[PDB]
């Protein structure tokens, strides 16, 4: 939910398109 580079999300994470916390292969669990 908190997103950093360890989240596998965008940095900073823009909430929408850069938020691969869903359908995520990079990372989403507790991210
Ligand atoms: Cd994110
Ligand atoms: Cd995330």
Short mmCIF file of N, CA, C and O and ligand atoms in Angstrom, two decimals:
data_model
loop_
_atom_site.label_atom_id
_atom_site.label_comp_id
_atom_site.label_asym_id
_atom_site.label_seq_id
_atom_site.Cartn_x
_atom_site.Cartn_y
_atom_site.Cartn_z
N UNK A 1 0.85 -1.18 0.00
CA UNK A 1 0.00 0.00 0.00
C UNK A 1 0.89 1.22 0.00
O UNK A 1 0.69 2.16 -0.78
N UNK A 2 1.87 1.19 0.88
CA UNK A 2 2.92 2.16 0.83
C UNK A 2 3.82 1.75 -0.29
O UNK A 2 4.26 0.59 -0.35
N UNK A 3 4.07 2.61 -1.20
CA UNK A 3 4.75 2.21 -2.36
C UNK A 3 6.07 2.91 -2.55
O UNK A 3 6.13 4.13 -2.62
N UNK A 4 7.08 2.12 -2.66
CA UNK A 4 8.44 2.57 -2.91
C UNK A 4 8.99 1.63 -3.96
O UNK A 4 8.19 0.84 -4.54
N UNK A 5 10.30 1.62 -4.18
CA UNK A 5 10.88 0.73 -5.20
C UNK A 5 10.82 -0.71 -4.74
O UNK A 5 10.79 -1.63 -5.55
N UNK A 6 10.72 -0.91 -3.42
CA UNK A 6 10.60 -2.26 -2.88
C UNK A 6 9.19 -2.78 -3.09
O UNK A 6 8.91 -3.97 -2.90
N UNK A 7 8.29 -1.91 -3.50
CA UNK A 7 6.95 -2.33 -3.72
C UNK A 7 6.80 -2.84 -5.13
O UNK A 7 5.84 -3.51 -5.45
N UNK A 8 7.73 -2.48 -6.00
CA UNK A 8 7.64 -2.91 -7.38
C UNK A 8 6.70 -2.02 -8.14
O UNK A 8 6.28 -2.31 -9.25
N UNK A 9 6.37 -0.93 -7.52
CA UNK A 9 5.51 0.04 -8.07
C UNK A 9 6.34 1.19 -8.60
O UNK A 9 7.57 1.17 -8.50
N UNK A 10 5.67 2.19 -9.13
CA UNK A 10 6.33 3.38 -9.60
C UNK A 10 6.83 4.17 -8.40
O UNK A 10 6.33 3.98 -7.27
N UNK A 11 7.82 5.02 -8.61
CA UNK A 11 8.42 5.80 -7.53
C UNK A 11 8.60 7.26 -7.98
O UNK A 11 9.50 7.56 -8.78
N UNK A 12 7.78 8.21 -7.47
CA UNK A 12 6.69 7.93 -6.53
C UNK A 12 5.53 7.26 -7.24
O UNK A 12 5.41 7.34 -8.48
N UNK A 13 4.71 6.59 -6.51
CA UNK A 13 3.66 5.88 -7.13
C UNK A 13 2.43 6.79 -7.27
O UNK A 13 1.97 7.37 -6.29
N UNK A 14 1.90 6.91 -8.50
CA UNK A 14 0.83 7.87 -8.82
C UNK A 14 -0.59 7.36 -8.50
O UNK A 14 -1.58 7.93 -8.96
N UNK A 15 -0.67 6.29 -7.75
CA UNK A 15 -1.97 5.76 -7.33
C UNK A 15 -2.73 4.96 -8.40
O UNK A 15 -3.30 3.90 -8.09
N UNK A 16 -2.74 5.44 -9.62
CA UNK A 16 -3.49 4.78 -10.67
C UNK A 16 -2.66 3.86 -11.55
O UNK A 16 -2.34 2.74 -11.15
N UNK A 17 -2.28 4.35 -12.72
CA UNK A 17 -1.59 3.57 -13.74
C UNK A 17 -0.26 2.99 -13.23
O UNK A 17 0.09 1.85 -13.52
N UNK A 18 0.45 3.76 -12.44
CA UNK A 18 1.72 3.30 -11.92
C UNK A 18 1.56 2.43 -10.69
O UNK A 18 2.55 2.01 -10.06
N UNK A 19 0.33 2.15 -10.32
CA UNK A 19 0.13 1.38 -9.17
C UNK A 19 -0.09 -0.07 -9.51
O UNK A 19 -1.22 -0.54 -9.56
N UNK A 20 0.97 -0.78 -9.75
CA UNK A 20 0.86 -2.18 -9.90
C UNK A 20 0.92 -2.82 -8.55
O UNK A 20 1.95 -3.24 -8.07
N UNK A 21 -0.15 -2.65 -7.86
CA UNK A 21 -0.39 -3.34 -6.61
C UNK A 21 -1.51 -4.33 -6.85
O UNK A 21 -1.93 -5.07 -5.96
N UNK A 22 -1.98 -4.32 -8.08
CA UNK A 22 -3.01 -5.18 -8.54
C UNK A 22 -2.52 -5.79 -9.85
O UNK A 22 -1.84 -5.10 -10.64
N UNK A 23 -2.76 -7.10 -10.04
CA UNK A 23 -2.27 -7.85 -11.21
C UNK A 23 -0.72 -7.75 -11.22
O UNK A 23 -0.07 -7.85 -12.26
N UNK A 24 -0.16 -7.62 -10.04
CA UNK A 24 1.22 -7.32 -9.88
C UNK A 24 2.08 -8.55 -9.82
O UNK A 24 1.79 -9.50 -9.09
N UNK A 25 3.09 -8.55 -10.63
CA UNK A 25 4.10 -9.57 -10.59
C UNK A 25 5.29 -9.01 -9.83
O UNK A 25 6.08 -9.75 -9.25
N UNK A 26 5.41 -7.70 -9.84
CA UNK A 26 6.48 -7.02 -9.17
C UNK A 26 6.28 -7.05 -7.64
O UNK A 26 7.15 -7.56 -6.91
N UNK A 27 5.15 -6.57 -7.18
CA UNK A 27 4.88 -6.57 -5.78
C UNK A 27 3.61 -5.82 -5.46
O UNK A 27 3.33 -4.76 -6.03
N UNK A 28 2.85 -6.36 -4.56
CA UNK A 28 1.62 -5.74 -4.17
C UNK A 28 1.25 -6.06 -2.75
O UNK A 28 0.66 -5.22 -2.06
N UNK A 29 1.59 -7.27 -2.32
CA UNK A 29 1.33 -7.75 -0.97
C UNK A 29 1.92 -6.81 0.08
O UNK A 29 3.15 -6.66 0.17
N UNK A 30 1.02 -6.14 0.81
CA UNK A 30 1.36 -5.15 1.85
C UNK A 30 2.07 -3.94 1.25
O UNK A 30 2.70 -3.15 1.96
N UNK A 31 1.90 -3.75 -0.04
CA UNK A 31 2.58 -2.69 -0.72
C UNK A 31 1.71 -1.48 -0.99
O UNK A 31 1.81 -0.84 -2.12
CD1 LIG B 1 1.54 1.47 -5.90
CD1 LIG B 2 2.38 -0.64 -4.39
#
